Write an enzyme that holds these catalytic residues in place. Structure first.
Site, mmCIF file in Angstrom:
data_model
loop_
_atom_site.group_PDB
_atom_site.id
_atom_site.type_symbol
_atom_site.label_atom_id
_atom_site.label_comp_id
_atom_site.label_asym_id
_atom_site.label_seq_id
_atom_site.Cartn_x
_atom_site.Cartn_y
_atom_site.Cartn_z
ATOM 1 N N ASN A 51 4.552 -11.687 2.367
ATOM 2 C CA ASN A 51 3.527 -11.603 1.311
ATOM 3 C C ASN A 51 4.052 -12.012 -0.071
ATOM 4 O O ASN A 51 3.280 -12.562 -0.841
ATOM 5 C CB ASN A 51 2.848 -10.223 1.233
ATOM 6 C CG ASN A 51 1.602 -10.105 2.069
ATOM 7 O OD1 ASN A 51 1.092 -11.095 2.601
ATOM 8 N ND2 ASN A 51 1.061 -8.894 2.193
ATOM 9 N N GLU A 110 6.260 -23.449 25.607
ATOM 10 C CA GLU A 110 6.998 -24.494 24.895
ATOM 11 C C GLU A 110 7.443 -24.061 23.510
ATOM 12 O O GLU A 110 8.483 -24.530 23.037
ATOM 13 C CB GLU A 110 6.226 -25.825 24.866
ATOM 14 C CG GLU A 110 7.148 -27.027 24.799
ATOM 15 C CD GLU A 110 6.488 -28.318 24.365
ATOM 16 O OE1 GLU A 110 5.327 -28.552 24.775
ATOM 17 O OE2 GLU A 110 7.107 -29.073 23.575
ATOM 18 N N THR A 152 0.820 -1.201 0.000
ATOM 19 C CA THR A 152 0.000 0.000 0.000
ATOM 20 C C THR A 152 0.870 1.274 0.000
ATOM 21 O O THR A 152 0.572 2.222 -0.724
ATOM 22 C CB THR A 152 -0.950 0.030 1.240
ATOM 23 O OG1 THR A 152 -1.446 -1.269 1.572
ATOM 24 C CG2 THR A 152 -2.118 0.960 1.041
HETATM 25 N N1 LIG Z 1 -1.609 -10.997 3.627
HETATM 26 C C1 LIG Z 1 -2.282 -9.857 3.772
HETATM 27 N N2 LIG Z 1 -1.626 -8.696 3.752
HETATM 28 C C2 LIG Z 1 -2.444 -7.630 3.916
HETATM 29 C C3 LIG Z 1 -3.817 -7.620 4.049
HETATM 30 N N3 LIG Z 1 -4.291 -6.322 4.135
HETATM 31 C C4 LIG Z 1 -3.212 -5.575 4.060
HETATM 32 N N4 LIG Z 1 -2.057 -6.312 3.933
HETATM 33 C C5 LIG Z 1 -0.669 -5.800 3.932
HETATM 34 O O1 LIG Z 1 -0.508 -4.948 5.057
HETATM 35 C C6 LIG Z 1 0.227 -3.753 4.690
HETATM 36 C C7 LIG Z 1 -0.614 -2.508 4.914
HETATM 37 O O2 LIG Z 1 -1.095 -2.490 6.273
HETATM 38 P P1 LIG Z 1 -2.654 -2.546 6.657
HETATM 39 O O3 LIG Z 1 -2.849 -3.614 7.659
HETATM 40 O O4 LIG Z 1 -3.560 -2.476 5.487
HETATM 41 O O5 LIG Z 1 -2.745 -1.126 7.392
HETATM 42 P P2 LIG Z 1 -3.342 -0.794 8.838
HETATM 43 O O6 LIG Z 1 -2.672 -1.639 9.846
HETATM 44 O O7 LIG Z 1 -4.817 -0.827 8.780
HETATM 45 O O8 LIG Z 1 -2.883 0.720 9.017
HETATM 46 P P3 LIG Z 1 -3.393 2.117 8.476
HETATM 47 O O9 LIG Z 1 -4.406 1.825 7.395
HETATM 48 O O10 LIG Z 1 -2.144 2.819 7.978
HETATM 49 O O11 LIG Z 1 -4.013 2.766 9.695
HETATM 50 C C8 LIG Z 1 0.672 -3.971 3.245
HETATM 51 O O12 LIG Z 1 1.960 -4.551 3.173
HETATM 52 C C9 LIG Z 1 -0.394 -4.925 2.702
HETATM 53 O O13 LIG Z 1 0.029 -5.689 1.582
HETATM 54 C C10 LIG Z 1 -4.497 -8.886 4.101
HETATM 55 O O14 LIG Z 1 -5.696 -9.069 4.295
HETATM 56 N N5 LIG Z 1 -3.634 -9.956 3.947
HETATM 57 C C1 LIG Z 2 4.268 6.173 -4.835
HETATM 58 O O1 LIG Z 2 3.601 5.477 -3.785
HETATM 59 C C2 LIG Z 2 2.365 5.880 -3.455
HETATM 60 C C3 LIG Z 2 1.655 6.958 -4.052
HETATM 61 C C4 LIG Z 2 0.366 7.188 -3.650
HETATM 62 C C5 LIG Z 2 -0.331 6.176 -2.921
HETATM 63 N N1 LIG Z 2 -1.692 6.253 -2.710
HETATM 64 N N2 LIG Z 2 -2.206 7.369 -2.531
HETATM 65 C C6 LIG Z 2 -3.211 7.639 -3.483
HETATM 66 C C7 LIG Z 2 -2.987 7.329 -4.855
HETATM 67 C C8 LIG Z 2 -3.941 7.614 -5.820
HETATM 68 O O2 LIG Z 2 -3.961 7.061 -7.079
HETATM 69 C C9 LIG Z 2 -3.617 5.692 -7.280
HETATM 70 C C10 LIG Z 2 -5.080 8.353 -5.442
HETATM 71 O O3 LIG Z 2 -5.978 8.776 -6.377
HETATM 72 C C11 LIG Z 2 -5.500 10.061 -6.791
HETATM 73 C C12 LIG Z 2 -5.292 8.709 -4.081
HETATM 74 O O4 LIG Z 2 -6.536 9.275 -3.864
HETATM 75 C C13 LIG Z 2 -6.695 10.150 -2.758
HETATM 76 C C14 LIG Z 2 -4.394 8.298 -3.084
HETATM 77 C C15 LIG Z 2 0.382 5.170 -2.231
HETATM 78 C C16 LIG Z 2 1.662 4.896 -2.643
HETATM 79 O O5 LIG Z 2 2.246 3.743 -2.277
#
Ligand SMILES: Nc1nc2c(ncn2[C@@H]2O[C@H](COP(=O)(O)OP(=O)(O)OP(=O)(O)O)[C@@H](O)[C@H]2O)c(=O)[nH]1
Ligand SMILES: COc1ccc(/N=N/c2cc(OC)c(OC)c(OC)c2)cc1O
Ligand SMILES: Nc1nc2c(ncn2[C@@H]2O[C@H](COP(=O)(O)OP(=O)(O)OP(=O)(O)O)[C@@H](O)[C@H]2O)c(=O)[nH]1
Ligand SMILES: [Ca+2]
Ligand SMILES: [Mg+2]
Ligand SMILES: [Mg+2]
Lengths: 155, 426, 436
Positions: free
Chosen positions: C206, C254, C179
């Site tokens: 992952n 354990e 993400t």
């Molecule tokens: N295997 C697995 N990985 C997940 C899943 N959901 C998110 N991830 C991984 O978890 C990471 C992102 O963290 P999340 O758990 O989505 O975030 P969060 O803990 O809710 O934190 P914030 O949204 O930042 O408040 C990334 O590396 C994702 O690929 C899931 O259901 N399964």
């Molecule tokens: C280069 O890495 C990152 C860049 C942005 C990331 N996501 N933030 C958003 C990205 C958006 O388009 C895909 C978006 O639509 C415009 C958006 O809407 C608010 C958020 C996450 C990344 O890991």
């Protein structure tokens, strides 16, 4: 002092006041603290009629302020096409250089007044004239990616 | 993180702002009377981000409309979606600002600033969880630029923990040859570097160049330029408005797109480029990265991508999109910084925009944006060196040191972009 | 019978949590409303499944579990899905604003608004326990909540439950399904701050799960649904010894005795076999020898690394199904005549064996075929240092430029915390190099 009043009348575009002040002995070539004359102010503020009136009454078309600006430099910078043409018709130095190494061509190019650029080119403006950083108007058009300007300068 | 409060200031701000409401209302199934005529339940899933629910299940935009010139209000209401706005959300003064940044920021604009803030407070307190703000404005005039930045600083003092996002329109002598615009824009950039979290740079130079050289419109109008702007604003807000796997918000975009606080100026891009009243995944990836599809007049191949976000809209294979995105990073590798790993993020949205089967929206934080800043800087310096029209500003209460400070800040900004463009991962 | 409380934090912890409790219900014969007809002791009991499930006077078997997230979208699905009636409504806790992929928001600013509510609700679960052994914590490394909130929670659990064991199931980031760009930052910050508060942690890479879903299950573009189903099967095999009768890893203590020779090097590698696609319903059945061999193939590992490059400090083999003990002995003897199994000279070169004679369960709608025998191998190998170095290098590329650091500093964190966290990871890499 009618000179300070003529300076103010040329900037504000007061045509009748310019005619009155000159008839009463105002110095057509009076200068402000920075060397600007009624013609510089008329050219800057776009008062075309005051420019022609002043030129029929002994104004120096090539007067320079403390920074070496001529009325033609200020008319090219601001974008007043009719005034640029009047100044060249009255002997303005097309290739005059200010303290920054700029000619009216450099200023018309930077500000994107392309019609004024064509007019300066037609009246002999030097495409090889360099500013204090060595840039010509063609270098400015290349560095800024202004294809419209580069085409005109390549004519 | 839900609601967004949108504010539109000045003539450019209101015109681009109205087109945004019209376009996103169409995508969401909303008509000018405020009723929902949509067929997909995915059109109301995140409708509250931009719309307030009202009696009768009516959807009212969370938009505030502001201008020192009164006539603007009449042009907003006479449009197709004119009566959809809240009649109480219009704050319009009596005397405009005549392209004077000082009028907008210090005198006529400052009188009408407490009135706008009363309306902002009302919309903000009625929000479950305010995400932040969205401002549309031009930087070349006086109200959108001078009063717009004043509004931003004021909002920033009252709501410090919220995101401030702007759609800022940059001047070009090709569209408007008003020599005071570099002054106005430079003064506003000086405020934007400090007070906004993210700014979409929408350049009138690039908009004109697209219409003239790519779209073959020898005489482009505001309508023509605003057609590219509305498609860009629709594309960059896709993920705030449609569910998707990501639960995207303004703060998550800021954390991930902005590595250094001042470098928050984005270069948006759109594909395909089309004109008013008139594609595969590999082509759409290519077009989205082409200098001719950028909304800022900068060549991306002159700089380096710090971070990129791309949104593909419509029905298509996500595996194909993943494949092509990785492929564009392989052959064009020297245009991405190697010290920010995995700096390209992609989203796929099922709902495409109006008239297009497929589209791609690009949001780049590129060091090539310094080209846009240098262009305005060179113009500001040409004018400032001759002190042309300086009295129009200093007579309104401004100090000549504010000009020196604005110019100094914008050149420091260009040096900072150059610094990260030349940095190596060693 | 000693109780175990599971805590699921953030989106990854919650979604993985949902898929685990579904599978646990299927293995113990518990219905989605909590009813269990094979349980003769109504309203109580001291059976092995009771370590994970409490009972009400109405015969309802409730998970000893807490779900926490700083935003409500993911937990709301649990509140309305198939197992909505299974959990204690007060056991599902949600804030309004998430940590925006920022460790500092999850730990310092947003996280502090809900920490006391979470701790008081966990105390309600702990008070209902006769002999609480500890906690199973599920979380991502990369999320703001999974990284920062989990750290703050682990700190507070160490003060309030000092004598109790803490085990983690952590999701290690992959570029293929991530993400945020700052996931390496969040990963190093949470590792440094949790290291002293966790007794054993099973990392799930992952990228390893994504690769297995593609290679073994023929899934073109795996989603979180496919990944979580495979993860829950592996987590089930790891926790089976806690919920059923057996002789290996029978309590949280354990797992430390068998798998953790030294406190800091508490990251065991899990390997699982066989993984067969459900579209191959009539597959040939693999022998005890074949599945055992499969445990030593890097492809079947939960963390991408090469154990041939490292040394083993412990090795546990957990079988499920039609598995004859003498066949395990013969397979191990054949495997010992191999140069790629090098134990550290200070540890016995033994393989501990546990066999549960029930075949694994598959969830309806899953991707796996049914098998008559499966094995999960848990080993502590210095080769897991490769996973730590890949993450540290990504951290270093960004940190050298201080990219993104202002977001952390603006949420009550000092810049000095980043260097202290990186120094701890440098020390951790040296701990693995000192062992061998
Ligand atoms: N295997 C697995 N990985 C997940 C899943 N959901 C998110 N991830 C991984 O978890 C990471 C992102 O963290 P999340 O758990 O989505 O975030 P969060 O803990 O809710 O934190 P914030 O949204 O930042 O408040 C990334 O590396 C994702 O690929 C899931 O259901 N399964
Ligand atoms: C280069 O890495 C990152 C860049 C942005 C990331 N996501 N933030 C958003 C990205 C958006 O388009 C895909 C978006 O639509 C415009 C958006 O809407 C608010 C958020 C996450 C990344 O890991
Ligand atoms: N793209 C685009 N640019 C516009 C539009 N309207 C104005 N502009 C640009 O905006 C700048 C002028 O700012 P305006 O928004 O008209 O001015 P204002 O903010 O209303 O301020 P004053 O009228 O001076 O008080 C110039 O660069 C114009 O080219 C529009 O609808 N589209
Ligand atoms: Ca019982
Ligand atoms: Mg206006
Ligand atoms: Mg989350």
């Amino acid at each position: 002092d009618l000179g300070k009043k003529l300076l103010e009348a040329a900037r504000a575009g007061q045509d009748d006041e310019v005619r009155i002040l000159m008839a009463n002995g105002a110095d057509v070539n009076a200068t402000d603290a920075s060397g600007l004359t009624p013609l510089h102010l008329a050219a800057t503020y776009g008062h075309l009629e005051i420019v022609e009136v002043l030129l029929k009454h002994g104004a120096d078309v090539n007067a320079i302020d403390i920074m070496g600006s001529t009325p033609l430099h200020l008319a090219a910078l601001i974008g007043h096409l009719e005034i640029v043409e009047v100044l060249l018709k009255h002997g303005a130095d097309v290739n005059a250089v200010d303290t920054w190494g700029d000619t009216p061509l450099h200023l018309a190019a930077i500000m994107g007044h392309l019609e004024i650029v064509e007019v300066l080119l037609k009246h002999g403006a030097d495409v090889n004239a360099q500013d204090k950083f060595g840039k010509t108007a063609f270098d400015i058009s290349i560095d800024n990616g202004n294809e419209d300007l580069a085409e005109i300068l390549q004519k | 993180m839900r609601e967004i409060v949108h504010i539109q200031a000045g003539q450019c701000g209101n015109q681009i702002g109205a087109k945004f409401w019209e376009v996103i209302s169409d995508e969401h199934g909303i008509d000018p009377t405020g009723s929902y005529h949509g067929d997909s339940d995915l059109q109301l899933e995140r409708i509250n981000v931009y719309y307030n629910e009202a009696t009768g299940n009516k959807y009212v935009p969370r938009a505030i409309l502001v201008d020192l010139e009164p006539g603007t209000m009449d042009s907003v209401r006479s449009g197709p979606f004119g009566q959809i706005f809240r009649p109480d959300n219009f704050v319009f003064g009596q005397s405009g600002a005549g392209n004077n940044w000082a009028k907008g920021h210090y005198t006529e604009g400052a009188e009408l600033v407490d009135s706008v803030l009363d309306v902002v407070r009302k919309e903000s307190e009625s929000c479950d969880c305010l995400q932040g703000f969205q401002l549309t404005h031009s930087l070349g005039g006086g109200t959108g630029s001078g009063m717009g930045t004043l509004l931003i600083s004021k909002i920033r003092e009252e709501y410090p923990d919220r995101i401030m996002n702007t759609f800022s329109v940059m001047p070009s002598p090709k569209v408007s040859d008003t020599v005071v615009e570099p002054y106005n824009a430079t003064l506003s950039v000086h405020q934007l570097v400090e007070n906004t979290d993210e700014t979409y740079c929408i350049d009138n130079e690039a908009l004109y160049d697209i219409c003239f050289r790519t779209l073959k419109l020898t005489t482009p109008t505001y309508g023509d330029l605003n057609h590219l702007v509305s498609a860009t604003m629709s594309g960059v807000t896709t993920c705030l408005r449609f569910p998707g796997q990501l639960n995207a918000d303004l703060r998550k975009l800021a954390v991930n797109m902005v590595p250094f606080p001042r470098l928050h100026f984005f270069m948006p891009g759109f594909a395909p480029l089309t004109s008013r009243g008139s594609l595969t995944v590999p082509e759409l990836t290519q077009q989205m990265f082409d200098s001719k599809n950028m909304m800022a007049a900068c060549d991306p191949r002159h700089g380096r991508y710090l971070t990129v976000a791309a949104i593909f809209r419509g029905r298509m294979s996500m595996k194909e999109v993943d494949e092509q995105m990785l492929n564009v990073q392989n052959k064009n590798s020297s245009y991405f910084v190697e010290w920010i790993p995995n700096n390209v993020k992609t989203a796929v949205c099922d709902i495409p925009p109006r008239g297009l089967k497929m589209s791609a929206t690009f949001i780049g934080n590129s060091t090539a944006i310094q080209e846009l800043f240098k262009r305005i800087s060179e113009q500001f310096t040409a004018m400032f060196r001759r002190k042309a029209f300086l009295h129009w500003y200093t007579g309104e209460g401004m100090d000549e040191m504010e000009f020196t400070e604005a110019e100094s800040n914008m050149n420091d900004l260009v040096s900072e972009y150059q610094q990260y463009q030349d940095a190596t991962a060693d | 019978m000693r109780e175990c409380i599971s805590i699921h934090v953030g989106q990854a912890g919650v979604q993985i949590g949902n898929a685990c409790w579904e599978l646990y219900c299927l293995e113990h014969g518990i219905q989605p409303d909590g009813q269990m007809p094979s349980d003769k002791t109504i309203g109580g009991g001291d059976d092995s499944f009771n370590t994970f499930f409490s009972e009400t006077g109405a015969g309802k078997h409730v998970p000893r579990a807490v779900f926490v997230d700083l935003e409500p979208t993911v937990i709301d699905e649990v509140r309305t899905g198939t197992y909505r009636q299974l959990f204690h409504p007060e056991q599902l806790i949600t804030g309004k604003e998430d940590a925006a992929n920022n460790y500092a928001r999850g730990h310092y600013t947003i996280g502090k608004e809900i920490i006391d509510l979470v701790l008081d609700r966990i105390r309600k679960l702990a008070d209902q326990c006769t002999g609480l052994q500890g906690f199973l914590v599920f979380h991502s490394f990369g999320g703001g909540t999974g990284s920062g909130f989990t750290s703050l929670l682990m700190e507070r659990l160490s003060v309030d439950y000092g004598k109790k064991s803490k085990l983690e199931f952590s999701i290690y980031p992959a570029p293929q399904v991530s993400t945020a760009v700052v996931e390496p930052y969040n990963s190093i910050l949470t590792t440094h701050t949790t290291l002293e508060h966790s007794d054993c942690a099973f990392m799930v890479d992952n990228e390893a799960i994504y690769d297995i879903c593609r290679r073994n299950l023929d899934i073109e573009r795996p989603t979180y649904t496919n990944l979580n189903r495979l993860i829950s099967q592996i987590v089930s095999s790891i926790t089976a010894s806690l919920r059923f009768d057996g002789a290996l890893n029978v309590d949280l203590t354990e797992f430390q005795t068998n798998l953790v020779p030294y406190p800091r090097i508490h990251f065991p590698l899990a390997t699982y076999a066989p993984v067969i696609s459900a579209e191959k319903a009539y597959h040939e059945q693999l022998s005890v020898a074949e599945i055992t061999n499969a445990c030593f193939e890097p492809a079947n590992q939960m963390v991408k690394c090469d154990p041939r490059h490292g040394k083993y400090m412990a090795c546990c083999l957990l079988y499920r199904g039609d598995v004859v003990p003498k066949d395990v002995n013969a397979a191990i003897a054949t495997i010992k005549t191999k140069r790629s199994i090098q134990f550290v000279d200070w540890c016995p070169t033994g393989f501990k064996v546990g066999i549960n004679y029930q075949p694994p369960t598959v969830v309806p709608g899953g991707d796996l075929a049914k098998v008559q025998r499966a094995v999960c191998m848990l080993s502590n190998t210095t080769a897991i240092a490769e996973a730590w170095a890949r993450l540290d290098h990504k951290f270093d590329l960004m940190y050298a430029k201080r990219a993104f650091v202002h977001w952390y500093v603006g949420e009550g964190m000092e810049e000095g915390e980043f260097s202290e966290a990186r120094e701890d990871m440098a020390a951790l890499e040296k701990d693995y190099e000192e062992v061998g």
